[PDB]
Amino acid sequence: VVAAAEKTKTKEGVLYVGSKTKEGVVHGVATVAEKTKEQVTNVGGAVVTGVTAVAQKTVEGAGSIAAATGFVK
Amino acid sequence: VVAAAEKTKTKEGVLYVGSKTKEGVVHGVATVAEKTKEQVTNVGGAVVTGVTAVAQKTVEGAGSIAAATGFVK
Amino acid sequence: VVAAAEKTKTKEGVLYVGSKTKEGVVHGVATVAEKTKEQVTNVGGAVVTGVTAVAQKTVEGAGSIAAATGFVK
Amino acid sequence: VVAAAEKTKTKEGVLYVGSKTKEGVVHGVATVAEKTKEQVTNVGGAVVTGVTAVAQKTVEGAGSIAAATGFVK
Amino acid sequence: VVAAAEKTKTKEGVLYVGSKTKEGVVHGVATVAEKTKEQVTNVGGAVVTGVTAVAQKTVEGAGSIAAATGFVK
């Protein structure tokens, strides 16, 4: 499991957000197990969670994610 | 499982968002197991979750995701 | 599990956010196990969780995430 | 599990946030186990959790996360 | 488990935040075990938790996190 990223090197990249929420419940990244034997989970990269969510320009530079997720029996 | 990313190198990339929500519930990335034996899960890359979700220009630079997900018995 | 990142080297990158929420519950990253035997979890990279969430320009420089998640029996 | 990061080397990178919340509960990163045998968890990278969450320019420099998470029996 | 970071070398990097919250409960990073046998947890990198959370420019310099988390039986 190898990840390699290389980077070699007027409004730009500007965000305005206004949010009004009377009630918010946000769970993000969740793993829940009840009465479970084996649970293998991988979350990688960018997760944005919101009642309002904005992602801008998330990976302008090279980004690499490598995941091996699992079990051997 | 190998990921490689390489990058070699007027309004641009500008977002305006206004959001109003009286109630919001957002779950993002969730794995739930009840009474489960084996559960293998991989989430990779960018997940944006919102009552309002905006993704702009997510990977201008080279992005790589590699996933191997599973079990061997 | 190897990750390598290399970086070699008017409004830019500016965000305005206004948020009003009467009530907020946010869970971020959560792993919950009840009555569970084995639970293996990996969260990698950037997670932004909010009643309002903004991510801007998250990885301008090269970013690498490598994950191996799991069990061998 | 090896991570290597190398870096070699008008408003820029400016954020304004205003937030008003009458009530906030935020959980950040949480692992909860009740009546659980084995729970292996890894959280890596940047997690921002908020009733309002802003992440700007999180990794301009090269960032690497490597995780091996799990058990061998 | 090895991490190596190398760094070799008008408003820039400026944040304004105003927050008003009548009530706040924030949990940061929490591991809770009740009636649990084995619980192995690793939190790495930057976690910002807030009723209002702002992260700006978190790792301009090269940052590396390496984690091995788990048990061998």
UniProtKB/Swiss-Prot annotation, chains A, B, C, D, E:
Coiled coil start-end: none
UniProt tissue specificity: Highly expressed in presynaptic terminals in the central nervous system. Expressed principally in brain.
Region (4 X 11 AA tandem repeats of [EGS]-K-T-K-[EQ]-[GQ]-V-X(4)): 6-44
Reported impact of E12K: No effect on oligomerization
The organism's place on the tree of life at top rank: Eukaryota
An example Gene Ontology biological process: positive regulation of endocytosis
Positions with a binding annotation for Cu cation: H27
UniProt subcellular location: Cytoplasm; Membrane; Nucleus; Synapse
GO cellular component terms attached to this protein's record: actin cytoskeleton; axon; axon terminus; cell cortex; cytoplasm; cytosol; extracellular region; extracellular space
Post-translational modification, as annotated: Phosphorylated, predominantly on serine residues. Phosphorylation by CK1 appears to occur on residues distinct from the residue phosphorylated by other kinases. Hallmark lesions of neurodegenerative synucleinopathies contain alpha-synuclein that is modified by nitration of tyrosine residues and possibly by dityrosine cross-linking to generated stable oligomers.
GO molecular function: actin binding; alpha-tubulin binding; beta-tubulin binding; calcium ion binding; copper ion binding; cuprous ion binding; cysteine-type endopeptidase inhibitor activity; dynein complex binding
Modified residues (Phosphoserine): S64
Sequence repeat residues: 10-18, 19-33, 34-44
Annotated signal sequence range: none
Keywords: Acetylation, Alzheimer disease, Amyloid, Cell projection, Copper, Cytoplasm, Disease variant, Membrane, Metal-binding, Neurodegeneration, Nucleus, Parkinson disease, Parkinsonism, Phosphoprotein, Repeat, Secreted, Synapse, Ubl conjugation
Function: Neuronal protein that plays several roles in synaptic activity such as regulation of synaptic vesicle trafficking and subsequent neurotransmitter release. Participates as a monomer in synaptic vesicle exocytosis by enhancing vesicle priming, fusion and dilation of exocytotic fusion pores. Mechanistically, acts by increasing local Ca(2+) release from microdomains which is essential for the enhancement of ATP-induced exocytosis.
Subunit: Soluble monomer. Homotetramer. A dynamic intracellular population of tetramers and monomers coexists normally and the tetramer plays an essential role in maintaining homeostasis. Interacts with UCHL1. Interacts with phospholipase D and histones. Interacts (via N-terminus) with synphilin-1/SNCAIP; this interaction promotes formation of SNCA inclusions in the cytoplasm. Interacts with CALM1. Interacts with STXBP1; this interaction controls SNCA self-replicating aggregation. Interacts with SNARE components VAMP2 and SNAP25; these interactions allows SNARE complex assembly and integrity.
UniProt note: domains: The 'non A-beta component of Alzheimer disease amyloid plaque' domain (NAC domain) is involved in fibrils formation. The middle hydrophobic region forms the core of the filaments. The C-terminus may regulate aggregation and determine the diameter of the filaments.
Entry's disease: Genetic alterations of SNCA resulting in aberrant polymerization into fibrils, are associated with several neurodegenerative diseases (synucleinopathies). SNCA fibrillar aggregates represent the major non A-beta component of Alzheimer disease amyloid plaque, and a major component of Lewy body inclusions. They are also found within Lewy body (LB)-like intraneuronal inclusions, glial inclusions and axonal spheroids in neurodegeneration with brain iron accumulation type 1. Parkinson disease 1, autosomal dominant: A complex neurodegenerative disorder characterized by bradykinesia, resting tremor, muscular rigidity and postural instability. Additional features are characteristic postural abnormalities, dysautonomia, dystonic cramps, and dementia. The pathology of Parkinson disease involves the loss of dopaminergic neurons in the substantia nigra and the presence of Lewy bodies (intraneuronal accumulations of aggregated proteins), in surviving neurons in various areas of the brain.
Similarity comment: Belongs to the synuclein family.
The protein's name in its UniProt record: Alpha-synuclein
Species for this entry: Homo sapiens (Human)
Organism placement in taxonomy: Eukaryota, Metazoa, Chordata, Craniata, Vertebrata
